[PDB]
Design a protein around this motif. Structure first.
Motif, short mmCIF file in Angstrom:
data_model
loop_
_atom_site.label_atom_id
_atom_site.label_comp_id
_atom_site.label_asym_id
_atom_site.label_seq_id
_atom_site.Cartn_x
_atom_site.Cartn_y
_atom_site.Cartn_z
N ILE A 92 1.04 -1.13 0.09
CA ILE A 92 -0.13 -0.16 0.05
C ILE A 92 0.83 1.32 0.05
O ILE A 92 1.71 1.48 0.61
CB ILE A 92 -0.96 0.13 1.15
N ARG A 93 0.52 2.06 -0.92
CA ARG A 93 1.51 3.18 -1.14
C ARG A 93 0.86 4.53 -0.22
O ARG A 93 -0.52 4.57 -0.39
CB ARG A 93 1.66 3.53 -2.36
N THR A 94 1.42 5.37 0.52
CA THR A 94 0.90 6.21 1.33
C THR A 94 0.63 7.20 0.45
O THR A 94 1.09 7.40 -0.75
CB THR A 94 1.53 6.59 2.65
N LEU A 95 -0.39 8.26 0.83
CA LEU A 95 -0.66 9.37 -0.12
C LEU A 95 0.28 9.98 -0.86
O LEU A 95 1.52 10.57 -0.49
CB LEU A 95 -1.36 10.49 1.17
N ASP A 96 0.02 10.13 -2.24
CA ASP A 96 0.94 10.46 -3.05
C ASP A 96 0.23 11.63 -3.90
O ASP A 96 0.13 11.29 -5.06
CB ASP A 96 1.17 9.30 -4.07
N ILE A 97 -0.17 12.56 -3.35
CA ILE A 97 -0.93 13.56 -4.04
C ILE A 97 -0.38 15.05 -3.74
O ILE A 97 0.06 15.29 -2.64
CB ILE A 97 -2.53 13.62 -3.68
N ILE B 42 10.33 1.76 0.37
CA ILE B 42 9.87 3.16 -0.72
C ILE B 42 9.80 3.05 -1.85
O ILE B 42 10.35 1.81 -2.79
CB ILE B 42 10.96 4.02 -0.42
N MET B 43 9.01 3.79 -2.71
CA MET B 43 9.10 4.23 -3.95
C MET B 43 10.56 4.59 -4.36
O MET B 43 10.74 5.41 -3.71
CB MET B 43 8.02 5.19 -4.40
N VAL B 44 11.10 4.12 -5.49
CA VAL B 44 12.34 4.82 -5.61
C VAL B 44 11.80 5.66 -7.22
O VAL B 44 11.63 4.78 -7.93
CB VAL B 44 13.41 3.97 -6.17
N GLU B 45 11.77 6.97 -7.17
CA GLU B 45 11.27 7.86 -8.36
C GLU B 45 12.16 9.01 -8.21
O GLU B 45 12.28 9.67 -9.38
CB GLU B 45 9.82 7.99 -8.23
N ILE B 46 12.45 9.46 -7.07
CA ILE B 46 13.37 10.71 -7.24
C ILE B 46 14.66 10.36 -7.55
O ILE B 46 15.14 9.33 -6.93
CB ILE B 46 13.38 11.59 -5.85
N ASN C 2 7.92 5.66 -14.14
CA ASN C 2 7.19 6.97 -14.73
C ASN C 2 8.00 8.12 -14.30
O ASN C 2 8.00 8.92 -15.04
CB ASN C 2 5.74 6.89 -14.51
N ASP C 3 7.81 8.44 -12.87
CA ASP C 3 8.21 9.32 -12.30
C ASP C 3 9.86 9.60 -12.33
O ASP C 3 10.51 10.65 -12.41
CB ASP C 3 7.68 9.89 -10.99
N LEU C 4 10.47 8.43 -12.10
CA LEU C 4 12.06 8.26 -12.21
C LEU C 4 12.35 8.99 -13.66
O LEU C 4 13.20 9.78 -13.59
CB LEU C 4 12.62 7.07 -12.06
MG LIG Z 1 4.98 8.15 -8.87
#
Ligand SMILES: [Mg+2]
Ligand SMILES: [Mg+2]
Lengths: 317, 316
Positions: A76-81, A173-177, A199-201
């Motif tokens: 579950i990914r925490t709030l990403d807005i 963690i999401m690795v995107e930065i 996508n964001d990476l």
């Molecule tokens: Mg993203």
């Protein structure tokens, strides 16, 4: 069969999982043979409304998915807005570059009241199945520590209330930065797993908003820089005995499958209907060959060369 | 210290240069002992007006700086502007995230008419002194090729017109998009030099707009990722026998000086008034020591701890 594993003819298995946006997506995920949910986006709880979602409301949604997935892991990914979602109640700043702004984990750390409600709901849902937590938009190990400090406060409060949760819950963690990929070695020591948000990476690494029609051509998922950062994350996870997943669109792209397999990616999470196509590719390429192909890709200097090669590979399969 | 070299006691020399935004900045640069101009920002020619700057207007400005610098290198950065700066005549589109949008070299490649006018003026100016060209916002080697193709067309025009320009003119890139740093080894084969734009490299690498007051704290120049990318760029240049400069604010930061020195940075370009302080630091630290300190910094995990260490290093 959807029940055959994603396993090469020479005996390398990987996990194929689903990305979902609401509990209603679960049936299709299972119908397509998903082995878990590699990304449960939680924005649906915050959007299209005029108040913050209650703990109970979030809990019911998380529990439903966790139960219906029958022991399979649900990440579950925490709030990403951010404020580009222009949500009235959220009371957010107007920003010149929202994609580089006050969003996701940055909003959560600034507003721990909001973050705690979601974490409470996730922890409560973890009593009912196999739940993992994933923080988005992480640039540094310092942020992971801050986020975990809050998580631990919440666990302690639940303990005091006698409310149960999985004490072994895995948190990654999401690795995107780009900085998170570049310092994956540092982060790998303090997260339980990585999931690569390609996508964001890709957008951050190439400094391109792919929704901007005037520069859309600059979004190049096969740029050598992206392949290098992906390899770095996978290798960093493995050095610490941890797993690397990918939930960006790349993981569902048939052209990327053999490279990702060869790089040692552990989990591919994707739109459910993409699962059979990727499984078929994995089941029909030797791991030893995939490693050779990944190595060839890493030696190439242009995205189009890698793409040409991968098109030839898929043609041959 | 003006005429004294930026050179360690054990003999490592580096070049200290100035960043400028208008020809009027030259006097102060020279006064502070600048050995060149590491960054000539050209946006002033496009601002505060109702139509594009003519080739002649641009030429006159570049020529003045190049002559006044008396043989010292002048690195001119091509148009770096985006739609966040409201220049109506320019007609650039509204964008959700202009920092990731249609700007700088992307604008120039889409509008070669604009690019050619500037390139002609720079080339013409190169006949009168030591000029370098630097492309901003490069994400890939393919873009460098496209830009050079237009440059070659312009060179060809000037040759047929019998107009003089430096045939040996050096052409490099600003490294500020993370992909350019990550693939510096690829780029190094096809550019003459790198200049690291750490302001934007830091913003893109950490995904933070430092002008956004809600997230300004996420902008961290000493984040280990930034140091690693800087080292990567310097090493990539050196492997190809080329030089690495830095013109972002970091190069003028006394806390960064010893790290940059120890990493082997060749050229530090900065606000003129920062030059004396940086020179003083370099002249008072052993290169061998700077290399150890750089190594220590590159072994640390937290920007805050790196900053603490560096404050102690220069305290003396
Ligand atoms: Mg993203
Ligand atoms: Mg810049």
């Amino acid at each position: 069969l959807k029940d055959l594993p994603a396993e090469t003819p020479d005996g390398k298995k990987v996990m194929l999982a689903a990305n979902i946006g609401t509990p209603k997506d679960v049936a299709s995920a299972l119908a397509n043979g998903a082995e878990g949910v590699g990304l449960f986006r939680t924005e649906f709880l915050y959007m299209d409304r005029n108040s913050l979602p209650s703990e109970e409301e979030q809990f019911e949604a998380y529990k439903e998915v966790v139960e219906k997935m029958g022991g399979r892991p649900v990440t579950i990914r925490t709030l990403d807005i951010g404020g580009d979602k222009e949500l009235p109640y959220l009371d957010m700043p107007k920003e010149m570059n929202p994609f580089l702004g006050y969003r996701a984990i940055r909003l959560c750390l600034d507003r721990p009241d909001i973050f705690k409600t979601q974490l409470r709901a996730i922890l409560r849902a973890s009593a009912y199945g196999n739940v993992q937590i994933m923080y988005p938009m992480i640039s540094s190990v310092e942020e992971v520590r801050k986020a975990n400090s809050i998580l631990e406060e919440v666990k302690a409060e639940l303990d005091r209330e006698g409310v149960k949760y999985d004490k072994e819950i895995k948190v990654g963690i999401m690795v995107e930065i780009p900085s998170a990929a570049v310092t994956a070695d540092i982060l790998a020591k303090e997260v339980d797993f990585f999931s690569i948000g390609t996508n964001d990476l890709t957008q951050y690494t190439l400094a391109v908003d792919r929704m901007n029609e005037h520069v859309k051509e600059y979004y190049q998922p096969f740029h050598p820089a992206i392949l290098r950062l992906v390899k770095m994350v996978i290798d960093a996870a493995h050095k610490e005995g941890k797993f690397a997943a990918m939930c960006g669109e790349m993981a569902g792209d048939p052209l990327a499958a053999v490279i990702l397999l060869g790089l040692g990616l552990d989990e591919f999470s994707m739109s459910a209907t993409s699962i059979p196509e990727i499984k078929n590719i994995i089941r029909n390429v030797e791991y030893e060959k995939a490693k050779e192909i990944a190595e060839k890709a890493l030696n190439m200097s242009e995205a189009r060369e890698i793409e040409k090669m991968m098109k030839d590979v898929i043609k041959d399969i």
